[PDB]
Amino acid sequence: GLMQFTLPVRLCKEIELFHFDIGPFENMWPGIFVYMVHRSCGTSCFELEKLCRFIMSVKKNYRRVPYHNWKHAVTVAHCMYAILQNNHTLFTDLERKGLLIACLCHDLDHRGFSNSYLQKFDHPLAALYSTSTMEQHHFSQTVSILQLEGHNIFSTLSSSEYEQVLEIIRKAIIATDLALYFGNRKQLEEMYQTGSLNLNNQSHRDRVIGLMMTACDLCSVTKLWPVTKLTANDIYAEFWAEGDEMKKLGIQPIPMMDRDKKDEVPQGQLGFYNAVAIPCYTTLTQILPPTEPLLKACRDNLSQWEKVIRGEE
Numbered sequence: 001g002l003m004q005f006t007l008p009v010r011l012c013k014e015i016e017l018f019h020f021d022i023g024p025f026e027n028m029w030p031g032i033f034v035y036m037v038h039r040s041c042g043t044s045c046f047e048l049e050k051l052c053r054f055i056m057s058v059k060k061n062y063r064r065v066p067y068h069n070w071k072h073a074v075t076v077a078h079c080m081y082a083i084l085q086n087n088h089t090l091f092t093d094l095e096r097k098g099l100l101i102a103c104l105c106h107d108l109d110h111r112g113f114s115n116s117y118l119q120k121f122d123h124p125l126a127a128l129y130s131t132s133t134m135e136q137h138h139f140s141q142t143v144s145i146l147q148l149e150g151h152n153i154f155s156t157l158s159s160s161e162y163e164q165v166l167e168i169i170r171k172a173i174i175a176t177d178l179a180l181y182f183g184n185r186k187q188l189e190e191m192y193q194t195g196s197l198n199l200n201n202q203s204h205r206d207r208v209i210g211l212m213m214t215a216c217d218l219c220s221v222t223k224l225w226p227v228t229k230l231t232a233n234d235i236y237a238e239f240w241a242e243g244d245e246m247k248k249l250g251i252q253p254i255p256m257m258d259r260d261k262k263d264e265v266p267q268g269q270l271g272f273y274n275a276v277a278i279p280c281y282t283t284l285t286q287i288l289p290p291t292e293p294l295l296k297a298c299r300d301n302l303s304q305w306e307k308v309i310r311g312e313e
């Protein structure tokens with residue numbers, strides 16, 4: 001009960017900042033996550049024995065893909081930790097529990113391929129789940145792991161609290177389907193601007209949590225430039241693998257996934273920042289003012305990509 005995780009001084013301080021990088025030492029990432037649950041939630045939220053066994057089963061069920069790996073899971077959970085900590089009183093006890101777990105599980109058993117590639121391959125998962133194919137799989141894998149003997153970290157919740165938390169985790173994971181983000185943000189934009197936004201409206205909270213999930217999931221674009229630049233290598237390593245597999249099915253991939261069109265990356269990153277990233281962190285900063293450092297970091301990185309195009313790097 002009296003057993004805290006404590007990080008070295010530099011990590012203790014930097015972990016509170018949005019732009020924190022969890023570093024190259026995989027064996028510290030579990031402790032970093034537990035530390036975040038303890039400060040975000042309390043040291044009583046979860047039985048440490050059960051949490052540790054849940055964390056290690058989740059790790060085991062992430063694959064060795066260049067980007068959609070265990071490091072991404074923990075990176076995305078840290079961004080959620082930073083949002084929750086800077087917005088203390090806006091979130092219920094259950095929401096804080098559910099969202100950190102949702103972020104850790106959000107890409108469980110990812111194979112490094114998009115929903116589009118699964119559908120064109122005619123993968124069995126595409127027959128079982130016609131939309132948000134991988135996201136329904138990620139939630140399915142999360143429930144499976146929760147049902148292993150000794151892995152039910154929620155066991156001390158009432159029946160109805162348990163139903164609410166799994167419902168938060170499901171919506172949270174489904175919302176990481178980027179195809180759903182555009183509509184979700186347009187709606188939140190309209191509600192904020194016409195003043196109809198109401199955080200006691202459960203349907204409104206769902207939407208806001210959805211946007212937080214998109215913000216955490218894209219948080220690669222909110223790190224310091226060298227982290228952002230080196231993560232883009234991993235992101236494109238998966239895309240180009242998928243493009244190779246499209247060509248094997250006799251389908252020219254979109255240029256984003258064609259390794260023959262590496263030259264067009266800087267312009268592709270610009271469009272992505274302008275069409276997805278900047279709009280996401282702007283609407284998030286309007287709804288939750290203390291998340292502005294994410295918008296500011298994103299704008300810095302947009303400017304760094306503009307500099308790449310102008311041959312200045």
Ligand SMILES: Cc1oc(-c2ccccc2)nc1CCOc1cccc2cccnc12
Pocket residue numbers: 217218219220221235255256257261264265266267268269271272
């Ligand atoms: C779809 C996507 O997602 C991310 C990303 C996702 C999460 C964090 C950081 C970046 N980056 C992208 C790249 C969007 O880039 C692109 C978009 C469109 C055409 C392109 C042509 C060549 C190269 N890139 C391109």
Ligand SMILES: [Mg+2]
Pocket residue numbers: 106107134176177
């Ligand atoms: Mg995903």
Ligand SMILES: [Zn+2]
Pocket residue numbers: 072076106107176217
């Ligand atoms: Zn993800």
